Enzyme design. Structure first.
Site, PDB file in Angstrom:
ATOM      1  N   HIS A  62      14.059  62.120  57.343  1.00  0.00           N
ATOM      2  CA  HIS A  62      12.599  61.801  57.460  1.00  0.00           C
ATOM      3  C   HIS A  62      12.297  60.444  56.819  1.00  0.00           C
ATOM      4  CE1 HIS A  62      12.320  66.010  58.642  1.00  0.00           C
ATOM      5  NE2 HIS A  62      12.854  66.380  57.453  1.00  0.00           N
ATOM      6  N   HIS A  92      10.274  56.894  47.727  1.00  0.00           N
ATOM      7  CA  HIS A  92      10.569  56.732  49.157  1.00  0.00           C
ATOM      8  C   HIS A  92       9.466  55.912  49.789  1.00  0.00           C
ATOM      9  CE1 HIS A  92       7.967  60.232  49.031  1.00  0.00           C
ATOM     10  NE2 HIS A  92       7.485  59.683  50.178  1.00  0.00           N
ATOM     11  N   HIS A  94       7.252  55.099  53.702  1.00  0.00           N
ATOM     12  CA  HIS A  94       6.864  55.355  55.099  1.00  0.00           C
ATOM     13  C   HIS A  94       6.635  54.008  55.762  1.00  0.00           C
ATOM     14  CE1 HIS A  94       6.085  59.632  54.011  1.00  0.00           C
ATOM     15  NE2 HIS A  94       5.831  59.065  52.858  1.00  0.00           N
ATOM     16  N   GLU A 104       0.477  55.333  55.306  1.00  0.00           N
ATOM     17  CA  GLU A 104      -0.161  56.663  55.443  1.00  0.00           C
ATOM     18  C   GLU A 104      -1.616  56.544  55.012  1.00  0.00           C
ATOM     19  OE1 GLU A 104       2.677  59.533  53.655  1.00  0.00           O
ATOM     20  OE2 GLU A 104       3.130  59.785  55.810  1.00  0.00           O
ATOM     21  N   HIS A 117       5.902  55.505  47.894  1.00  0.00           N
ATOM     22  CA  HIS A 117       5.492  56.694  47.119  1.00  0.00           C
ATOM     23  C   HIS A 117       6.464  56.891  45.972  1.00  0.00           C
ATOM     24  CE1 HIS A 117       3.220  58.310  50.806  1.00  0.00           C
ATOM     25  NE2 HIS A 117       2.549  57.356  50.137  1.00  0.00           N
ATOM     26  N   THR A 196       2.402  64.646  52.017  1.00  0.00           N
ATOM     27  CA  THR A 196       2.108  64.123  53.382  1.00  0.00           C
ATOM     28  C   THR A 196       3.161  64.569  54.385  1.00  0.00           C
ATOM     29  OG1 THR A 196       3.263  62.030  53.165  1.00  0.00           O
ATOM     30  CG2 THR A 196       0.919  62.106  52.397  1.00  0.00           C
TER      31      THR A 196
HETATM   32  N1  LIG Z   1       5.108  61.850  51.010  1.00  0.00           N
HETATM   33  S1  LIG Z   1       4.791  62.509  49.619  1.00  0.00           S
HETATM   34  O1  LIG Z   1       4.904  61.531  48.568  1.00  0.00           O
HETATM   35  O2  LIG Z   1       3.522  63.197  49.714  1.00  0.00           O
HETATM   36  C1  LIG Z   1       6.009  63.762  49.317  1.00  0.00           C
HETATM   37  C2  LIG Z   1       6.576  63.862  48.054  1.00  0.00           C
HETATM   38  C3  LIG Z   1       7.542  64.830  47.821  1.00  0.00           C
HETATM   39  C4  LIG Z   1       7.923  65.730  48.805  1.00  0.00           C
HETATM   40  C5  LIG Z   1       9.070  66.709  48.552  1.00  0.00           C
HETATM   41  C6  LIG Z   1       8.759  68.122  48.749  1.00  0.00           C
HETATM   42  N2  LIG Z   1       9.847  68.998  48.261  1.00  0.00           N
HETATM   43  C7  LIG Z   1       9.599  70.264  47.932  1.00  0.00           C
HETATM   44  S2  LIG Z   1       8.122  70.858  48.314  1.00  0.00           S
HETATM   45  N3  LIG Z   1      10.399  71.137  47.253  1.00  0.00           N
HETATM   46  C8  LIG Z   1      11.615  71.015  46.544  1.00  0.00           C
HETATM   47  C9  LIG Z   1      11.710  71.686  45.326  1.00  0.00           C
HETATM   48  C10 LIG Z   1      12.643  71.290  44.382  1.00  0.00           C
HETATM   49  C11 LIG Z   1      13.489  70.224  44.663  1.00  0.00           C
HETATM   50  I1  LIG Z   1      14.558  69.296  43.090  1.00  0.00           I
HETATM   51  C12 LIG Z   1      13.501  69.649  45.929  1.00  0.00           C
HETATM   52  C13 LIG Z   1      12.565  70.051  46.869  1.00  0.00           C
HETATM   53  C14 LIG Z   1       7.319  65.647  50.036  1.00  0.00           C
HETATM   54  C15 LIG Z   1       6.371  64.669  50.305  1.00  0.00           C
HETATM   55 ZN   LIG Z   2       5.654  59.915  50.977  1.00  0.00          ZN
END
Ligand SMILES: NS(=O)(=O)c1ccc(CCNC(=S)Nc2ccc(I)cc2)cc1
Ligand SMILES: [Zn+2]
Length: 258
Positions: A62, A92, A94, A104, A117, A196
């Site tokens: 992604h 990371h 986008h 975004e 981000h 997001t």
């Molecule tokens: N684009 S953003 O900045 O809003 C964004 C940021 C972060 C994530 C990572 C979601 N991962 C999750 S929920 N669990 C997970 C739980 C523990 C571990 I170590 C790895 C994964 C997604 C999107």
């Molecule tokens: Zn992000």
């Protein structure tokens, strides 16, 4: 038929697997600069990245994540709208297929070429997986990228991307200093929102810096040579990995500045 950014699995589809996609505090949003109110109560923002320990860079299909050692308080974000201490775990980006899209968040409906981000989790919840279950679990520092002059502090990232072209590839990525990705000013907007990407959890305090960083056309072109696919699958360029602006609903965007 997993989520992604194509015609058949893109953001307009996510609500079927992740109904919170149509929730009350989704991200990103458009920042209407005329409607955002200065909040004199916002404490100064504290970005303490001097002890940051980067470990690895990963193409996750992604985006690519630069991952940090978050097993102690080294690189932390505090102050601004935040209560307590948030540990940096990864950053990371986008980005777009063209320089006119990719961010975004938008600013008065302006799209930037890309958005950084820096993802941090609240240390009072003990681990990242527990923090994403809480309304104040994460703090994401959002930084716009426009195309112009090169960002010298980004080139070490750009130069490793050939080694993680496809989904599931990783490379060692030690001693990277994320202070080289910051703009001069820490003036920001802040609002309560979400991840997001799926699972779109409503766990994020968003802190979006007003000053964009400049990156070169050659730097963003290297982001667009990444692949969403795995090795030995048909090539699909990793471009337009952004979610569009979501309804603000019952939220106020606060400004740290006049
Ligand atoms: N684009 S953003 O900045 O809003 C964004 C940021 C972060 C994530 C990572 C979601 N991962 C999750 S929920 N669990 C997970 C739980 C523990 C571990 I170590 C790895 C994964 C997604 C999107
Ligand atoms: Zn992000």
């Amino acid at each position: 038929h997993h989520w992604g950014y194509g015609k058949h699995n893109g953001p307009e589809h996510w609500h079927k697997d992740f109904p919170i996609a149509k929730g009350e505090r989704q991200s990103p949003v458009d920042i209407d600069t005329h409607t955002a109110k200065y909040d004199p109560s916002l404490k100064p923002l504290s970005v303490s990245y001097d002890q940051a320990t980067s470990l690895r860079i990963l193409n996750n299909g992604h985006a690519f994540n630069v991952e940090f050692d978050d097993s102690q308080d080294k690189a932390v974000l505090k102050g601004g709208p935040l209560d307590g201490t948030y540990r940096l775990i990864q950053f990371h980006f986008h980005w777009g297929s063209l320089d006119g899209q990719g961010s975004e968040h938008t600013v008065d409906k302006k799209k930037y070429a890309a958005e950084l981000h820096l993802v941090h989790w609240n240390t009072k919840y003990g681990d990242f997986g527990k923090a994403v279950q809480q309304p104040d679990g994460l703090a994401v520092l959002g930084i716009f990228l426009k195309v112009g002059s090169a960002k010298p502090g980004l080139q070490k990232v750009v130069d490793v991307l050939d080694s993680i072209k496809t989904k599931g590839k990783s490379a060692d990525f030690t001693n990277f200093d994320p202070r080289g990705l910051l703009p001069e000013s820490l003036d920001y907007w802040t609002y309560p929102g979400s991840l997001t990407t799926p699972p779109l959890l409503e766990c994020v305090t968003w802190i979006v810096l007003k000053e964009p960083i400049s990156v070169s056309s050659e730097q963003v072109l290297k982001f667009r040579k990444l692949n969403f696919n795995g090795e030995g699958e048909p090539e699909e360029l990793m471009v337009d990995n952004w979610r569009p602006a979501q309804p603000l609903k019952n939220r106020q965007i606060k400004a740290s500045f006049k």
